[PDB]
Amino acid sequence: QYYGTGRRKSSVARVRLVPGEGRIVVNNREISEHIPSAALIEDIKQPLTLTETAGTYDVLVNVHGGGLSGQAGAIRHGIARALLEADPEYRTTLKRAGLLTRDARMKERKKYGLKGARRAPQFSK
Amino acid sequence: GQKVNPVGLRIGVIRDWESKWYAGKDYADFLHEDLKIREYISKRLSDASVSKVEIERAANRVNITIHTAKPGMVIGKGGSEVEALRKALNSLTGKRVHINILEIKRADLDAQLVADNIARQLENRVSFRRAQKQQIQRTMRAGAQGVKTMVSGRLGGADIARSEYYSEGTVPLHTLRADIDYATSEADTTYGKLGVKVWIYRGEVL
Amino acid sequence: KGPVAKRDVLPDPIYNSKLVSRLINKMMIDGKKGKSQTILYKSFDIIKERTGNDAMEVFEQALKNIMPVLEVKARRVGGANYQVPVEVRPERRTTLGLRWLVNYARLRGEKTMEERLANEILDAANNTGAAVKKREDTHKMAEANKAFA
Amino acid sequence: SLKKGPFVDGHLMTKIEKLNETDKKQVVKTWSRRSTIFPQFIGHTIAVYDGRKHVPVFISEDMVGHKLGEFAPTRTYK
Amino acid sequence: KRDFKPGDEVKVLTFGQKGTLLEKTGGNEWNVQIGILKMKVKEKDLEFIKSAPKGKDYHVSLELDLRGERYENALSRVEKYLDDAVLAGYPRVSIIHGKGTGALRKGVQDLLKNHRSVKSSRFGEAGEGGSGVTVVELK
Amino acid sequence: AKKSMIAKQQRTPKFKVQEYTRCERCGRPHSVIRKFKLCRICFRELAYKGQIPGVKKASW
Amino acid sequence: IRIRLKAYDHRILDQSAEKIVETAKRSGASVSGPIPLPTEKSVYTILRAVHKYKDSREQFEMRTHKRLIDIVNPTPQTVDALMRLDLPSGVDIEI
RNA sequence: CAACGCGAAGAACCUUACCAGGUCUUGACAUCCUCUGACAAUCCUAGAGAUAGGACGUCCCCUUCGGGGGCAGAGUGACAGGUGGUGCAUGGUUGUCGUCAGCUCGUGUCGUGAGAUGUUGGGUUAAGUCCCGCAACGAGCGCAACCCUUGAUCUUAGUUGCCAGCAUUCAGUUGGGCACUCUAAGGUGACUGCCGGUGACAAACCGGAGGAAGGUGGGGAUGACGUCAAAUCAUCAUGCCCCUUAUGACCUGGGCUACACACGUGCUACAAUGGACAGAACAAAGGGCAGCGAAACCGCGAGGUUAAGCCAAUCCCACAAAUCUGUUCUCAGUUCGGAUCGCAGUCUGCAACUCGACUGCGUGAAGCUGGAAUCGCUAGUAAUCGCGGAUCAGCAUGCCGCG
């Protein structure tokens, strides 16, 4: 019944979480077929392992935008701010590892005279 | 090459488009219509000096205001020529028009009028030094915060063109908070073409 | 100018054994995520079957056997192009060892990538790899030109 | 290349069918190198403009589906 | 039905007010100016009405005194003053000048002679005070 | 030879293909914009001068 | 009833739309709030020089904003009141 | 460097200027003059222009109806037209050093004068940034800030968006409601602000606490005096030169796409971190009315047919790809690679031959990581993955932008 907001990279996750057993799900569909890789199934359980609220809570998230790590980071930062609004007594401990810092890792604007974002065209005398 | 135009940079953030109306699916012919109507007033009222014109398209009936102070004689006994020019405008635009005239106080520090002036005595063959120097002192006597004037071309020395300027006060083009007003005018003489540019800084915008 | 260094892709902080560290993160210098990690896991497994003991244990033993301590840099002094050896910083050490591991992993040329990296893990745990070979090559050449400093 | 028929310009048609109707013999002039060949102009001769000069060419039986521009090379070489 | 045209005065049933026809966008859809509004109106919704068939903040004085100042400063503001007199429609005006240097006293009178609006400039009469005024009249 | 061809531009040709677009403010045949029927240099001039009621200089 | 208004500058849209809202609320009508619809950009791209250097360019756009207002009850007895008003030519009014 | 996927953000005719041929001369066209006075349109004959004759064929509006105005035709003479050169006559433009921190001036001193001092010295900064000195004292263009966007939050407003607690669906679909997201306005926030330390205490510098953000947060815009006699007479214009029996017009066709070679910039490959086949997903940003065109049906496919909706946060473009899971291929000039060709078609357009793109076929090239060399790139970057837009009948590996 506890709420958080998660934005990572053109991808905003609205997460509401309730006490539970650790059932993890998005858009009433299981993660394991929605994200297949364990390197992003670690994202959900990583903050609730650096703190101790691992098995007492389960999460319900609505998500839009970006690519797979794109909402993976969004999930992460959403459950982060959710646990800050839950028990902010370990706010300091969570801040020490970070994960509340909104990462400025968005795509850069393509600029004229260039290919991509920084690559100059091939140049010779 | 050169700089960007200060007022082109300041369009939409400090400056008005002077074409405030909106068209959609008639944008094109509406737009070229504002060009030829501006051409008509520009080469008709060149005697009494015009700087800028704002066009309104309220209910597609065109609406015009015209600036500057010397058309105080256009406003006066020349209500007849106001009516006649407006009849020619409705002859040109299909749907009719209504015009207004706005007096300008301190017409000395308006860029269009300055540039037209310098082009005029350059056609009248005063020295460019004299022209620029009296005009700049006249503006900063009028109260302008800073004025720089330009001239380029065959400045008497037909065998090699060059450029000349004088400026004092402060002219902060790099600051976008500044109010700048830019003109260019093209003085034609027997030597060919002589270019006039002028811009006026008139304090910042809070 | 100004020396900077930065963390990248480190795993979860607490109870980070190196096996879970490279199970969840780490190394992964093959390209993009996906067809870089799966394959690494398969290589890691095909050596538990080969030697029935700890995969990460033999993996860091292989890394240890790859670890150099001397690396040479060239100099412009003199018209004979002398080269001077320096001590390798540990971050440079691990990234450079892992670099040679991956490059003759893809160079060693077996039928597929997982058995390629698997045989490289075996041939670096034992001292019969091309990377071990070049390790001793730079070691002995640094010992040869060590007189300069 | 479309099944609404091959494309020609009408005026050259009218003269060439009246030509092969009454008297097959002499040559026909054109400036249009664009017309698709029809299989009923076998045996005649056409002076086709190449851009610089009118060139005669003979139409055989197998000359079907082409255009008359295939035979007046506009550009030369060594 | 009626053969409606652009510019026809017309009322819409759904809004009940008088308006003006502009154009026909569809087989039975038109563009209608209703007052300031521009509703796309279907043809069953229209009912026919009729078919197609300054500055004032100023007052201007009748005289001007121009004593003790510059030539090329003044002629900017005597051209302005003549334009103001036309806006108020004065047939006659005067510009009082100085005596000593006298350059502008002879200088202004040549400008009005070639000015596009003034026909003449004349000195005063004995009943007015003589050379205490010099008069100007316009076209 | 510039101005015969713009006369060719307003007066209609014989086929629907031949109506190549032009800008009549300045007669460049290349690089006109359909939204304004206006090409590059004479677009930029009046664009900095103030018209085209909604154009501003981009920065993002 | 619905009304749709759009123009290039939200400094005309703000007080025009607020003036319409306040006129409706002072008149006898039920009217909700103006929802600011998403602005869209038509980016134009144009060369600097006349002849060469296509590696030089400038970017222009056509920022036009749209606000959306509905009247809840139809209120014919005050459509004349919200009809008589006028807005400048800068903004187009749509139902 | 600072020319070379450059003008040209699109050459079948047009564009187009160039060439061959066929044409015309107050003319493609503009202002006037003098008459007919409203006028040309439209279809047949040869016929590319254009001519020849007919058909409504030269027919408007104000007119105290006298005559005027518009709007053409005919004729004429002043004229018109020049992408006909000269960026070394030029205006207006643009690149370049260089986003480098420099560039200068007023007044006063010193020299005689050229000039100097300010602007040097100590310290500091991304910075002529700042501080302290100092015969300089100040000032300006500069730099920074002010603008836009991107990062965190408050209030307002909840529909064409959202679905939280609700009830019901194939789907927020509905019934409901702005909670949340979002939309976009107004705002709040970061300023060495604070602490500790170094530094003369000065300017700063270092580390912390806070903080979404910390030391100009990131990115954009913004280009000083000037240099290259840089380029642009293809927007503009004295100057000479072109003629009206042509360097000016019209028309058709060709050329701008050629080909023994070389250079540049890109694309695609040389493969098993792969290829083929099946399945499962997950974006942003734009466009759409002589337009986008749904679903459905036909066709293997390009596409075709009747066609729903949408002037759009409703509808359409529009099924994103890379990715992941599984099966197979088993290291080869290959189920790699697809070049070039033959055949049959699709779309557009008067027209696809020179000279368009696409589809189904068959054929299948070289090429098994590239010498001397040489380039880009400090993190959402590089590298890869697709997706839009302009230009537009049809045509994009190029450009711009998006994730």
Coordinates of C-alpha atoms (C1' of nucleotides) in Angstrom, one line a residue, chain A residues 3-5 7-10 12 14 16 33-34 36 60 62-69 71 77 81 91-92 95 100-125, chain H residues 1-2 4 150-153 162-165 179-182 210-213 217-221 264-267 280-284 322 324-325 374-385 398-403:
Chain A
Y3 CA 4.2 4.2 -3.0
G4 CA 7.3 5.2 -4.9
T5 CA 8.3 6.7 -8.2
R7 CA 12.6 7.2 -13.5
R8 CA 15.8 5.9 -15.1
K9 CA 16.1 6.6 -18.8
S10 CA 13.1 7.7 -20.8
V12 CA 9.1 6.0 -15.6
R14 CA 5.1 3.8 -10.7
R16 CA 3.1 0.4 -5.2
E33 CA 10.0 -14.0 -18.8
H34 CA 9.7 -10.2 -19.0
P36 CA 15.2 -12.9 -18.7
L60 CA 3.5 -4.2 -7.8
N62 CA 3.3 -0.1 -13.5
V63 CA 6.0 0.7 -16.1
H64 CA 6.3 2.5 -19.4
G65 CA 9.1 3.4 -21.8
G66 CA 12.7 2.6 -22.7
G67 CA 14.5 -0.7 -22.9
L68 CA 15.1 -3.5 -20.6
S69 CA 17.8 -2.1 -18.4
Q71 CA 13.1 0.0 -16.7
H77 CA 15.0 3.8 -8.0
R81 CA 12.0 5.9 -2.9
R91 CA 17.9 6.5 4.7
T92 CA 21.5 7.2 5.6
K95 CA 22.2 6.8 0.7
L100 CA 18.6 7.7 -4.7
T101 CA 20.8 9.9 -6.9
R102 CA 18.9 10.3 -10.1
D103 CA 21.4 9.2 -12.7
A104 CA 21.9 11.7 -15.6
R105 CA 22.7 8.8 -18.0
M106 CA 20.2 9.8 -20.7
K107 CA 20.9 9.7 -24.5
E108 CA 22.7 12.7 -25.9
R109 CA 21.3 15.0 -28.6
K110 CA 22.5 14.3 -32.1
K111 CA 24.2 17.4 -33.4
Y112 CA 24.8 18.5 -37.0
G113 CA 28.2 18.2 -38.5
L114 CA 28.5 14.9 -36.7
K115 CA 27.5 11.3 -37.0
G116 CA 25.8 9.9 -33.9
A117 CA 26.8 12.2 -31.0
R118 CA 30.5 12.7 -31.0
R119 CA 31.9 10.8 -34.1
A120 CA 33.4 13.2 -36.6
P121 CA 33.4 12.1 -40.2
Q122 CA 36.6 10.6 -41.5
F123 CA 39.0 13.4 -42.3
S124 CA 42.2 13.5 -44.4
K125 CA 44.5 16.2 -45.8
Chain H
rC1 C1' 43.6 22.0 -43.2
rA2 C1' 39.5 25.8 -44.0
rC4 C1' 35.7 17.0 -52.9
rU150 C1' 17.9 17.9 -19.5
rG151 C1' 18.3 16.3 -14.4
rA152 C1' 14.6 16.7 -7.9
rU153 C1' 10.1 18.6 -6.0
rC162 C1' -3.8 7.9 -16.4
rC163 C1' -6.4 3.0 -13.1
rA164 C1' -5.3 3.5 -6.9
rG165 C1' -8.8 1.7 -3.8
rA179 C1' -5.0 8.8 -6.8
rC180 C1' -0.5 7.9 -9.6
rU181 C1' 1.9 8.4 -14.3
rC182 C1' 1.7 12.1 -17.8
rG210 C1' 24.0 17.6 3.5
rG211 C1' 21.6 17.3 -0.9
rA212 C1' 18.1 14.5 -7.2
rA213 C1' 21.9 17.4 -8.5
rG217 C1' 25.4 19.6 -12.9
rG218 C1' 25.2 18.0 -18.5
rG219 C1' 24.1 19.6 -23.4
rG220 C1' 22.6 23.4 -26.7
rA221 C1' 22.4 28.5 -28.5
rG264 C1' 38.1 10.9 -51.0
rU265 C1' 33.8 10.0 -48.2
rG266 C1' 30.2 6.2 -46.9
rC267 C1' 27.5 1.3 -47.1
rA280 C1' 8.2 -14.2 -26.6
rA281 C1' 8.7 -9.1 -25.9
rC282 C1' 10.5 -3.9 -24.6
rA283 C1' 11.2 2.8 -27.1
rA284 C1' 11.4 7.7 -28.1
rA322 C1' 19.0 -5.2 -31.5
rC324 C1' 15.9 -13.4 -24.9
rU325 C1' 14.2 -19.0 -25.4
rU374 C1' 46.2 7.0 -41.4
rC375 C1' 41.4 8.6 -38.6
rG376 C1' 37.3 9.2 -34.8
rC377 C1' 36.3 8.7 -29.7
rU378 C1' 36.8 10.7 -21.9
rA379 C1' 30.7 6.9 -20.3
rG380 C1' 24.6 6.6 -22.0
rU381 C1' 30.2 8.4 -24.8
rA382 C1' 32.3 4.9 -28.3
rA383 C1' 30.5 0.7 -30.9
rU384 C1' 26.1 -1.5 -32.6
rC385 C1' 20.2 -1.6 -33.1
rG398 C1' 23.3 11.0 -48.1
rC399 C1' 21.5 14.7 -44.3
rC400 C1' 18.7 16.0 -40.0
rG401 C1' 16.6 14.1 -35.5
rC402 C1' 14.7 10.1 -32.2
rG403 C1' 15.1 6.4 -28.7

